[PDB]
Amino acid sequence: NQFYSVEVGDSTFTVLKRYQNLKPIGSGIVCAAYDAVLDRNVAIKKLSRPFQNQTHAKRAYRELVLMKCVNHKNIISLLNVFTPQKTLEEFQDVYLVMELMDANLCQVIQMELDHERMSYLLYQMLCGIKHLHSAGIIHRDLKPSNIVVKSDCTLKILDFGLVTRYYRAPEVILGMGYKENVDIWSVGCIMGEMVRHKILFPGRDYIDQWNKVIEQLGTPCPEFMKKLQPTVRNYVENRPKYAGLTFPKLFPDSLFPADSEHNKLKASQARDLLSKMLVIDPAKRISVDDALQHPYINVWYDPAEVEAPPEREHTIEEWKELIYKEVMN
Numbered sequence: 547n548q549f550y551s552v553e554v555g556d557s558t559f560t561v562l563k564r565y566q567n568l569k570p571i572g573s574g575i576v577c578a579a580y581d582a583v584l585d586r587n588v589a590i591k592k593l594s595r596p597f598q599n600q601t602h603a604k605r606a607y608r609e610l611v612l613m614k615c616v617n618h619k620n621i622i623s624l625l626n627v628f629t630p631q632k633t634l635e636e637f638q639d640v641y642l643v644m645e646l647m648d649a650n651l652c653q654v655i656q657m658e659l660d661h662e663r664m665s666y667l668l669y670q671m672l673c674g675i676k677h678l679h680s681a682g683i684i685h686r687d688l689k690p691s692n693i694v695v696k697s698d699c700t701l702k703i704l705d706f707g708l709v710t711r712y713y714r715a716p717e718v719i720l721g722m723g724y725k726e727n728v729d730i731w732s733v734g735c736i737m738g739e740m741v742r743h744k745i746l747f748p749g750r751d752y753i754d755q756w757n758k759v760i761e762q763l764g765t766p767c768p769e770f771m772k773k774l775q776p777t778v779r780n781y782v783e784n785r786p787k788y789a790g791l792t793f794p795k796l797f798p799d800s801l802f803p804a805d806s807e808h809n810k811l812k813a814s815q816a817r818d819l820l821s822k823m824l825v826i827d828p829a830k831r832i833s834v835d836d837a838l839q840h841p842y843i844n845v846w847y848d849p850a851e852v853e854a855p856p857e858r859e860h861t862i863e864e865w866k867e868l869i870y871k872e873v874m875n
């Protein structure tokens with residue numbers, strides 16, 4: 547046989563014969579293929595020995611399990627799951643199949659800012675994020691490289707969350723505990739980068755990253771401070787203080803289209819949602835539902851899309867069988 551092996555760079559793709567003309571589309575190594583059974587192009591992801599360590603295995607199992615707990619157009623949906631290996635003893639690799647997409651969100655970020663497309667992309671992120679939260683899934687590590695887009699501007703989130711750390715919320719950076727609106731920060735970080743065309747909060751580690759957060763947004767309120775653990779609290783309170791730049795100064799008018807009255811209004815609304823999403827204190831940060839009702843977003847609102855019906859430690863030997871069972875069903 548049912549399988550055939552093809553060399554794609556260094557790794558060998560042993561896939562079902564239904565999948566033809568494999569081409570590399572990013573590195574878990576990923577391939578574009580034509581599905582002869584479905585008569586449509588697919589993306590196939592190869593998990594090379596996912597059971598190899600606690601980190602690789604826990605994510606692989608969790609995400610394989612969650613891909614059947616989720617049913618939404620803005621979240622990845624599996625078309626097929628298979629392994630070439632015949633038994634548990636021989637079991638090495640896992641191959642995952644989904645609809646082929648046109649672009650990564652990193653590429654779309656580089657593009658010129660258009661309000662119709664930006665708001666629809668952001669609307670879709672919020673729909674997917676809401677669908678996860680409705681199913682009891684808070685992402686905590688939402689980033690553009692794990693988001694894919696079609697030419698018709700339809701969007702899909704590829705992973706299920708908790709390496710690029712820039713889009714992580716203050717509560718993740720400082721280990722605070724969280725609610726659903728932790729993912730709002732990440733959305734704000736993507737939305738801001740689409741405007742500035744620069745990573746808002748860069749850094750080689752969390753120290754640099756936090757410095758970038760406070761320099762631009764200012765030192766958080768005392769209420770935020772007392773929610774920190776004593777050792778983290780000590781560090782944050784003893785950081786050099788900043789007033790924080792205003793959002794008109796964070797994202798100047800020059801970064802927005804202002805050739806019409808429609809664009810001038812949408813620019814103020816966009817800067818306004820940013821000021822409600824890029825809020826350090828999660829107690830003050832906008833929720834998913836309120837972000838969906840915001841004038842900049844609610845133009846796309848749809849009840850069918852928005853309002854949709856919805857862990858242990860093991861050895862490498864135990865993870866192998868757990869993953870194998872899910873593949874074989």
Ligand SMILES: O=c1n(C2CCOCC2)nc(-c2ccnc(NC3CCCCC3)c2)n1-c1ccc2ccccc2c1
Nearest residue numbers: 571572573589590591642643644646647648649650691
């Ligand atoms: O894992 C990825 N990535 C990248 C790899 C590079 O680093 C970041 C994540 N890109 C895609 C993927 C999915 C669908 N379509 C595409 N198409 C590409 C065509 C070329 C231009 C970029 C998008 C990629 N996938 C991918 C592919 C199949 C998958 C199957 C099941 C579950 C998740 C999957 C994810």
